[PDB]
Amino acid sequence: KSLSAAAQACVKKMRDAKVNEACIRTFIAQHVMVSKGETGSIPDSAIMPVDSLDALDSLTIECDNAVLQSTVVLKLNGGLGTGMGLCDAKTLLEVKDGKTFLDFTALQVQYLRQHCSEHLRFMLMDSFNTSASTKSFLKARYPWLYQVFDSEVELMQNQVPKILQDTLEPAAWAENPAYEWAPPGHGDIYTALYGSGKLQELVEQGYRYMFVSNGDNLGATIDKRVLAYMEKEKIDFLMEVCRRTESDKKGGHLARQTVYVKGKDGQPDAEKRVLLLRESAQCPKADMESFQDINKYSFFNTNNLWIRLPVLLETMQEHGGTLPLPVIRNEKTVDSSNSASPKVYQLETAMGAAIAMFESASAIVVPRSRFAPVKTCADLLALRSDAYVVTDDFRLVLDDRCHGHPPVVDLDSAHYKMMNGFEKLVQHGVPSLVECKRVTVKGLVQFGAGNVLTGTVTIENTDSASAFVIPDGAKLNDTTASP
């Protein structure tokens, strides 16, 4: 087949494991790229900034309900609560009043079906680690989703072999063979949608738009103005971006790029401009300063994506049933825990990289309320507090008294990085944070019932086994509370 021996081993291992062919072809193409010594480097000289974009806040027109009848909501749901020390699906974490991220999405989907469109489709992208727990919760709480879980709801993320850095052969780890496999990033969504046969079914049933976002980003809700905008401007791929701030300077940014493409067979040569994403790893060392200049590059990807399904099907068909995204070459050991285990590459792609694959690709600036991932227990504390309220359509929004500014929460990593320690801290209640500008917690602390915080509050305890407990009903305003 003219493959490399290393590549042939990967094909054999993936075929033995009954990996679908669309995943194999995608992976082999990436394998060939890495065989060629592909850097992935994106020098500043290869890009230009984006200075102007339309803003969601400036938009007003809502699409009609017919558009929603042709819309699929897809939530990424492969992540575990690893960061929180959790070892199961992050979307099953209680966010507010006994509801999870998954409750809120399902309630939102149900609200739109009841009031706007019954045909609105809901999908979840699962991994092997989240599938079962995602099924039983739906079984327990949303039977209408459970009945069609396998047929309509679930999209299974592929797994691909980790390869040895020196030979590019499939790594072997007899101690735990599962460590021989790894997910391919959220870029896999296209490979999964196509390969599983789902992309075509959705198009065949007449679905036109898919809205993709993180399961743990409660800000990412259907906005009918975005659908109108895509209809009006004939957009095939829309990326919601946010303004970059000092805290964001290490994250990726949007950029412009001018490409010239050689025509294949009877096609003319084409010079066009594309949008793209640049990450820290892809950025060369000398431009790092440039990379962190928020004024120069001012937008970052939220992973809130809006895609025209028929064009996606088309584009992937023209590329041989695949989508050629930039390959990220994760450097690890087969066992992350064992530094002496064989060094490997894990090949992955970013679903946001697809913005460069469409001629009618655009980006729109959205407020940061649409980018509210819960990455820490600090984020979780804010959400649970009375700073956030639940709308009629089951959205989570800041109370009006916050004036669009959420409370800044800094929890001591030594005790509250784990859900274990964090649930002790709020064991007797969640303090009122609606009026608090900033709360900082150092050392071991427990809130009392009825605590109310305003202004800038620090709660600081010096002795490690103390267990400093705030009195019930205590109100702290602009102060530092020590024992």
Ligand X SMILES: N[C@@H](Cc1ccccc1)C(=O)O
Alpha helices (H) along 185-271: 188-195, 198-204, 224-233
Cβ 404 to ligand X, closest distance in Å? 5
Question: Which listed range, 68-76, 87-95, 227-235, 364-372, lies at the site for ligand X (CB under 6 A)?
Answer: 364-372
Neighbours of 106 (CB within 10 A): 22
* Shorter beta-carbon distance to ligand X: residue 249 or 368: 368
Binding to ligand X, residues 403-422 (CB under 6 A)? 404
Q: Which of 264, 375, 417, 424 is catalytic?
A: 375
Q: How far is the CB of 4 from ligand X (least distance, A)?
A: 45
Q: Of 242 and 444, which has the nearer Cβ to ligand X?
A: 242
| CB-facing half-sphere around the CA of 351: CA atoms within 13 A | 28
> Residue 478, SS3?
coil
Q: Is 215 annotated as a binding residue?
A: yes
Rounded to whole angstroms, how far apart are CA atoms 309 and 162?
30
Nearer CB in complex with ligand X: 161/406: 406
Q: Determine the size of the site formed for ligand X (CB under 6 A).
A: 6
Name residue, tokens 């990967």.
Answer: 10
Question: Tokens 């919760």 — which residue?
Answer: 137
Q: Per the structure block, which two tokens stand in for 225?
A: 């103005």
For residue 441, is it left (φ>0), alpha (ψ between -120 and 50) or beta? beta
The least CB distance from residue 368 to ligand X, in Å, is 3
Say which DSSP state 393 is in: T
369 is a site residue for ligand X (CB under 6 A) = yes
Residue 13: active-site member: no
Task: Establish whether 304 is an annotated binding residue.
Answer: no
Residue 364 to residue 88: CA distance in whole angstroms: 34
Q: Give the distance, in angstroms, between the CA of residue 250 and the centroid of all CA atoms in the same chain.
A: 17
Q: Does 367 bind ligand X (CB under 6 A)?
A: yes
Residue 243 CB, nearest approach to ligand X (Å): 3
Residue 117 CB coordination number (10 Å): 17
**Residue 81 annotated as part of some ligand binding site:** no
Which one of 78-86, 232-240, 363-371, 386-394 is the stretch in contact with ligand X (CB under 6 A)? Answer: 363-371
Q: How far is CA 107 from CA 122, 142, 225, 443, in A?
A: 11, 9, 20, 38
Ligand-binding annotation for 303, yes or no, is yes
Q: Which of residues 46-105 bind ligand X (CB under 6 A)?
A: none
Give the nearer residue to ligand X in terms of CB position, either 83 or 367: 367
User: Residue 376's closest CA among 330, 425, 437, 328?
Assistant: 425
129 in a known ligand binding site: no
The CB-nearest residue to ligand X is 243
Return all residues near 99 (Cβ < 8 A) that are at least 6 apart.
Answer: 107
Site for ligand X (CB under 6 A): which residue of 368, 417, 442, 475? 368
Q: Who contacts 257 (Cβ-Cβ below 8 Å, separation ≥6)?
A: 46, 47, 48, 273, 274, 275, 276, 356
Q: Are 184 and 161 in contact (CB under 8 A)?
A: no
String of contacts with ligand X for each residue 197-226, x by CB under 6 A: ------------------------------
Q: Which stretch binds ligand X (CB under 6 A): 44-52, 282-290, 318-326, 365-373?
A: 365-373
Residue 214 marked as a ligand binder = yes
Tell me which stretch binds ligand X (CB under 6 A): 6-14, 311-319, 367-375, 414-422: 367-375
Please give the annotated binding residues, written as ranges: 78-79, 90, 157, 185-186, 214-216, 250, 252, 279, 301, 303, 375
Which residues are marked as active site?
375
Q: Site residues (CB under 6 A) for ligand X?
A: 242-243, 367-369, 404
Please give the annotated binding residues for UDP-alpha-D-glucose, written as ranges: 78-79, 157, 185-186, 214-215, 250, 252, 279, 301, 303, 375
